[PDB]
Design an enzyme around this catalytic site. Structure first.
Site, PDB file in Angstrom:
ATOM      1  CG  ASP A 112       1.021  -1.071   9.044  1.00  0.00           C
ATOM      2  OD1 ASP A 112      -0.216  -1.029   9.238  1.00  0.00           O
ATOM      3  OD2 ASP A 112       1.821  -1.633   9.823  1.00  0.00           O
ATOM      4  CG  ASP A 114      -2.457   1.629   3.891  1.00  0.00           C
ATOM      5  OD1 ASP A 114      -1.700   0.665   4.115  1.00  0.00           O
ATOM      6  OD2 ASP A 114      -3.563   1.750   4.448  1.00  0.00           O
ATOM      7  CG  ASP A 156      -7.154   1.165   0.193  1.00  0.00           C
ATOM      8  OD1 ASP A 156      -7.386   0.770  -0.975  1.00  0.00           O
ATOM      9  OD2 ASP A 156      -6.508   0.484   1.016  1.00  0.00           O
ATOM     10  NE  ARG A 207      -8.876  -5.543  -0.447  1.00  0.00           N
ATOM     11  CZ  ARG A 207      -8.198  -5.145   0.633  1.00  0.00           C
ATOM     12  NH1 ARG A 207      -7.639  -3.931   0.684  1.00  0.00           N
ATOM     13  NH2 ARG A 207      -8.067  -5.964   1.659  1.00  0.00           N
TER      14      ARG A 207
END
Length: 330
Positions: A112, A114, A156, A207
């Protein structure tokens, strides 16, 4: 101003800034906001990262995340020298948002945790977002008991967020840099249109970005010490990859781990030393751009004007300009 797919973004525009010194003061100002017309938040807090004595303390603590939910015309701008130990989420019918000059580090929350996250949901999908001149950092350490998630995503987006410029950001000491489409079933992400440019990606794992579906333009970015994989284009996604500067990077341009591959249009990329390649574990189809050959032509007009830094100059230019505390230099 913004260049690329997020070029129309004005955020809160010329509204007089609201000074917010804390996580809670920022959220409170967002909550009180009518939701459109313009809000500018000047973040003045100075989190002392040295108060975090154990990187592995973070994942077990709850996340601290500012939410902009179904509200539009917002600027979040860090003051010079400001630092946050909280992240920011833009969700739903939320449009025209600038997140700029924030230093976001070592967040609590694990999976979590982020840093900057944009997400569509049943109410709508964010658009016209400019994520610019931020510095996002965590640790590459894999904490005991944390699974794959001692920290989470850097910058993201998922579920059909569209028309976004991710520019002049500095992401370092970060495992999972940038997600774009959260799974192979995220078919709404075919709507995604993202420009990633003049970002600094250093000492990171993967990523960079992970792209599923949609169209992207990845140009004038500097990659260094990327240890697992770089640009990973998947699920029919297409990326125009132009005038970047690559060095000390494994799998710099790849498509792996999705049920279906993505494609790239490669031009004028500076390929330095330390480029390595690997074959992915598993059964799924893959491709490695070992000879730097385009696998698809970018299928449409970008629909915007952009100025390219000569590829060989991208390292120096990006080091000079990327991140928070740079006076927004371009």
């Amino acid at each position: 101003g913004p260049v690329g797919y997020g070029a129309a973004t004005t955020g809160g525009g010329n509204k007089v800034p609201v000074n917010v010194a804390t996580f809670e003061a920022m959220q409170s100002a967002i909550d009180s906001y009518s939701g459109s017309g313009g809000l500018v938040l000047n973040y003045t807090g100075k989190f002392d990262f040295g108060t975090i004595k154990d990187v592995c303390a973070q994942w077990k603590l709850p996340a601290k995340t500012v939410q902009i939910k179904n509200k539009s015309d917002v600027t979040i701008k860090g003051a010079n020298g400001s630092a946050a130990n909280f992240g920011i989420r833009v969700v739903g019918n939320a449009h025209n948002v600038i997140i700029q000059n924030m230093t976001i580090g070592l967040l609590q929350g694990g999976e979590d945790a982020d840093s900057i996250s944009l997400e569509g949901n049943s109410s709508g999908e964010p658009s016209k977002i400019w994520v610019d001149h931020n510095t996002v950092f965590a640790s590459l350490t894999k904490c005991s008991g944390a699974g794959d998630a001692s920290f989470d995503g850097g910058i993201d987006m998922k579920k059909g967020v569209h028309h976004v410029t991710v520019s002049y950001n500095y992401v370092y000491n970060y495992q999972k840099v940038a997600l774009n489409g959260y799974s192979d079933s995220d078919t709404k992400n075919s709507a995604a249109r993202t420009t990633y440019h003049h970002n600094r990606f250093e000492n990171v794992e993967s990523r960079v970005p992970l792209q599923r579906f949609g169209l992207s333009h990845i140009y004038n970015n500097y990659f260094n010490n990327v240890t697992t994989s770089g640009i990973n284009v998947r699920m029919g996604g297409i990326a125009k990859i132009e005038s970047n500067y690559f060095e000390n990077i494994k799998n710099p341009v790849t498509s792996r781990d999705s049920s279906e591959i993505g494609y790239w249009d490669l031009i004028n990329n500076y390929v330095g030393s330390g480029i390595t390649w690997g074959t992915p574990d598993g059964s799924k189809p893959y491709a490695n751009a070992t000879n730097w050959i385009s696998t698809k032509v970018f299928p449409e007009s970008l629909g915007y004007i952009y100025t390219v830094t000569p590829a060989a100059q991208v390292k120096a230019k990006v080091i000079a300009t990327a991140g928070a505390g740079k006076n927004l230099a371009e």
